[PDB]
Structure formats: C-alpha cells, structure tokens
Amino acid sequence: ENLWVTVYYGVPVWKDAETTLFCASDAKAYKKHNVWATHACVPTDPNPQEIHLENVTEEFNMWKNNMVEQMHTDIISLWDQSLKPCVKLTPLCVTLQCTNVNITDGELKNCSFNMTTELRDKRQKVHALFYKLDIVPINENQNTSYRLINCNTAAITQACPKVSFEPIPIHYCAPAGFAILKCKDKKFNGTGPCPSVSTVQCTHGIKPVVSTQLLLNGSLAEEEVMIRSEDIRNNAKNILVQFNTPVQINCTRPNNNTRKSIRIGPGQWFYATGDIIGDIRQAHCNVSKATWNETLGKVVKQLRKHFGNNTIIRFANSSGGDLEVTTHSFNCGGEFFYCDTSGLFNSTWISNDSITLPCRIKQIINMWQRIGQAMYAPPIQGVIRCVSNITGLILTRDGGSTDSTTETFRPSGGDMRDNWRSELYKYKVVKIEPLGVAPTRCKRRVV
C-alpha cells in the first residue's frame, strides 16, 4: 500500500558551515599572563577522547579553510588589545647628535639628546645606544644630525616588559553543537577524499610562532617529506614543503647588554641599552651542514616527481625589495632577528664544519602591516641563545623561461599567515542537522 512519513531526532547528518571558536588551554601555573590570554580561557580536558570512524568519505580544502582567517583575526586583535595600557613614547623623537661607536676602521652608535623630567621646567641630557637600522639622517649636507625612522609617518608605543612574547600551546575548541573532523591519511596531497576520518572533541596545542621564508617549531611529517601547493603549473602560488626530520639551528647574540632606565614623566619609565660591556661582535646563527645537504637531497628527490624524471633543479637567494621577506625573520628570547639566508640556497643539482649566517637586529619594528602604529621593543639583559627545529620551507616557483629543464627556485616570505596552514590543513569545522524524514508504514491512532 501507500507509505507515510517519519521524523527522526538525533540522526547523524552534517553540513559544511562556519562559526566562531574559543580558546582552550591546559592546567599550568607559573612574570605571567603573557599576551596570549591564559586566565581568561577554558582548561582543557586531561585526555582527548579521539573517536574513529569507518566507511565515511568527505572532501577537504586547505586553501579555502575558514579557521586560518579567524585565527589571524584573533591573534591581531589580542596583540592590539594587550598594548593599550602601556607607556607611549611621544617625546622621544627630539633631534639627535649621534657619534660613532672608538673602533677604528660598526653596527651601533651612541646618541645623546635632551629629555624632559617630572618637573615641567627642568631638562636633562641623557645618552643611549641605537642600532643602525633605526636611525635616518636629516641633514645629508653633510654633518651628523640623526632622527628616528617611524615618527616621520606614524606614532610609536613602548612594550612595557611585565608581559612576555613566548609562544604557548593554544587549542581551538568548537562550541556545543558543532564538531571537528580530522583526516589521518599518509598521502594527503592537499585536496580530495580521505579514507581514515576521525572525530575529536577539539585539536591539540598550536604554537603561533611568526616566521618568514622558514617555518619553525612546526609538526613533523611521517615516513616522507611533503610537497604541497594549490596549483603547481603557475607561478602565482607559494609552494609549501614539510620535512620528515627536524634540522637543528642555533642562533646566538654574544653581546652583554645592560638595561638603563630613565624617567620621561610623572609615573612613566623609558628603558634603553645603556652600555655594551665586553666584546663587540656580530650576532650569528649556525646550522649543521651534512644534515642540510641530506635534507635538500631528499626534498629534490621528492620534487622530481612533479617535474619529469630527469630535470635540473637549481636554487637561488631572495629577489629583494624589503627587510622582512628577503631575509629570515623571527623572534626569540624577547628580541627580533634578521638572519640572511643566502648561504643556504646556493647549490645546483643534476641527475663538524657547520654553516654560519650573519644576523642583524632591529628595535623599532612595524610588524602586522598597518598605519599609525609602531611597537618599540625593550632590550633583554645578559645573553641570548635560541635553539630551534627548522622543519618547513616556502618556495615560489620561478619566472618565465622560453624552454629548458633547468627551472630555479627562490624562497620568499609568505603572507604572514601560511605558518599556521602547516598545522590547520587536517581540520574542518562542521555543524549537525539532527532532523530528517523517512518513508515507511504508519497509522497513528486518532482515538
């Protein structure tokens, strides 16, 4: 006979959607409450209850995900909000009379200038040390009269040192009503179905570390190196590479700085590098040589699959045009470095003596590209020594060539958000639709 309708509540049916997510951290105690808020967050569960699934297929897309935009927005909003009640360095841009450091024939210079005091009529004269990348001449014809770099265009605020910039794990946990699906394929080329799919309460820890031309402290691959992109046959998309074994890298600044605090007004303070005591030397960074050559051999052997079984692979240094996406830029120990990376992509491939790299240091940075804002950085006392696991690579394909088998590769700084795409390519938020209709025989007694 004919059939009737039935409504089911609790049926497993999902639909690709998007929404907001909140913080999730683990129970930890400490000079605390860094820029990433910890007290105003949810303590995660002790053990995540990962649940496996079978006979389930669905699609993915790492270049159209919506979690990375929300993560970037949250990061920038938090970084902006954690700098409002801090000190403002308005009267710092007084003209300078800065001299050379008496090292005969140089990186830093001693500058002396006038500064106010708590009493509105008194004027003191103080001296400090400034790096060569934070000073621009004003006369040029030809005497030495220097000024800062940022207060020709934008304002400047200090970063009072009661907070820290050390990255900490942050779990993104979906609200009640949604779910997250994790793919566990060992050959996930970036887009397409994934056989092994699991459902977890929410993700693991993520270290929001900022880096250019080289990922850091990421997640290691398995059994192979991964070479991912969106479209390989066009020179308009950065190509991501993930290693299978982390390479050790040691950056060091052997100087011995001193923090010198001076008054700038009633209730304010201004820190500077008062003096350098010891040996004036350039901050450097070391990387192992044999492991680097082995990793480059592995990555070129893996990359040969996409460009014919017999081609010439060459590397070249950055093209140029900036100070942030030409060198290798990162932060550690409370200081921002800029280490040249030309001594790495200087080989040519066809068919215990470690490597060294110089590094420069900036203080007045303009990170998180914007207008009207510039963040000063306080100096760190003592010495700094940062060990890291370089794992990633970001490479633009090449320019246009007539015809050959010798295409080159040049590294270039990405869009300051692809660092998280090496960690959020196996996650996807989804909603639940517990309603549905099904046909079968029923006759509800009217009685």
Epitope: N234, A236, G321, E324, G413
Partner: antibody, heavy 123, light 105 residues
Framework: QVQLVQSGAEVKKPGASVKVSCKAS????????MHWVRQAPGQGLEWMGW????????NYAQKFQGRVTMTRDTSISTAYMELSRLRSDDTAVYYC????????????????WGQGTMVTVSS | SALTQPRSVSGSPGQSVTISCTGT?????????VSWYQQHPGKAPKLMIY???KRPSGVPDRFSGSKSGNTASLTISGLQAEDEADYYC?????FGGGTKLTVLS
C-alpha cells in the same frame, strides 16, 4: 573608476636607464598583484614580471634577470620600473596590468589594462 | 614550450568565422583554460573571453569560444564591421604568435 594611468617617456640613448610609472585609483592597492608586459611593434606580447605591492616581493622572467628593478611607494599608491644598460632591440611599448575583477580566484589571466607608454631608443 | 597560431585568416561580412590553435597537448592537457585577448591597432588590449566556456561582463556574447578534446577554438558568429583587430591566445605565462582577422570591403 578602476583604471591605471602612466607617464609618457622620451626617446633615450643607448646605455641609459628608463623610468616607467603606473598609478592606480579606486580599488585598494595593497590587495592584488601587478604585472608588467611588453609589446614589440609588429610582434607578439612578452611577459616581464610581477610585483606584489603588499610586501614588495617581486618575481621576473629570466630574459630580464639582473637588469630590471621594481619598487613601490604604497604611501601614494604608485609603482615604478627601472631599466639600465639598454640595447637597440628593446624598442617596444610597456603596460601595467592587474586582476581586480574576475569570478575565478587564480592570478591569471589579467583583464584590465592601462594607457601604455611606447619607449624607443636611438643611437 | 610555447603556443602558436596562424598569422592571418580570411573573413567575409555576415559569414561566421572560426579560429583554432593549440600547441603540444602535453603542456596543455586540456585544463590550462587558455584565454583570448583582442589587440586593437594602436590601442589598449582588452579581454574577450577568460579561462574557458565563460564570458566576462561588459562584452557581447555574439562571438565566443570553446574547448574541444585537443584544441581550443573561437567562433565569431555574425561577423560585423567592427572586428578589425588581432586575436591572441594566452596561457598562465605563455603567449601565442598572433592572428589577424580581415574583412572584405
């Protein structure tokens, strides 16, 4: 309106450096790439390179490798193009193109163009 | 490698005309979605049809292209007295030689 203006250039002598400009208006300038293309009189087109005004990251073909420099001044939303050590076969017309409006998300192909400037040299 | 195309093809008023060009299929593969540009004499070129099987806004669809199994073609249906311009095919970065479409006075 979405458009691109340029500045006409005079004939230059061999061994000199040319200065090419390209000024946009309307749409936001720090969101999309910008390419440079050349057209020889009586021949086909040839691509020169592409600059990203957001971060100054450039990439140009190998035919002009080591002879062209591309900069950007986002304070006034203008671009630049320099080229020294010229020859006689570089007599052409130059164009700056973008991809402001298209349904697809890929960088190619570009649709909107500008006026263009014809640069030629005389010994 | 590169894309090639015939230098010039004849055309009569009113008659529908065609232009077809394609290099080696190993680089094309049928999915690069070659575009088509119109180069006017002494003017600024403009896009006639982007990647494939789709027409952009602002241009009439009286003449359009298609992609066969091994060759991309462009059919000009209802030729008129305003088609005196060169036609170029363009890949992501590669370009063609050039085609001229002439009419009879």
């Amino acid at each position: 309106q979405v458009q691109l203006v340029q500045s006409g250039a005079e004939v230059k002598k061999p061994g000199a450096s040319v200065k090419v400009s390209c000024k946009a208006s309307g749409y936001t300038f720090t969101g999309y790439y910008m390419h440079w293309v050349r057209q020889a009189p009586g021949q086909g087109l040839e691509w020169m390179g592409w600059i990203n005004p957001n971060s100054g990251g450039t990439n140009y073909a190998q035919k002009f490798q080591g002879r062209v420099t591309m900069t950007r001044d986002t304070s006034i939303s203008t671009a630049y193009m320099e080229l020294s050590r010229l020859r006689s076969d570089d007599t052409a017309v130059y164009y700056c193109a973008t991809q402001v409006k298209l349904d697809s998300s890929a960088g190619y192909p570009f649709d909107i163009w500008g006026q263009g400037t014809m640069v030629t040299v005389s010994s | 490698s590169a894309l090639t195309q015939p230098r010039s093809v004849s055309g009569s008023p009113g008659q529908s005309v065609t232009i077809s060009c394609t290099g080696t299929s190993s680089d094309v593969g049928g999915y690069n979605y070659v575009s088509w540009y119109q180069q006017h004499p002494g003017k600024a070129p403009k896009l006639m049809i982007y990647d494939v099987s789709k027409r952009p806004s602002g241009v009439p669809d009286r003449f359009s292209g298609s992609k066969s199994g091994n060759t991309a073609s462009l059919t000009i249906s209802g030729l008129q007295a305003e088609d005196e311009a060169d036609y170029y095919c363009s890949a992501f970065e590669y370009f063609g030689g050039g085609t001229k479409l002439t009419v009879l006075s």
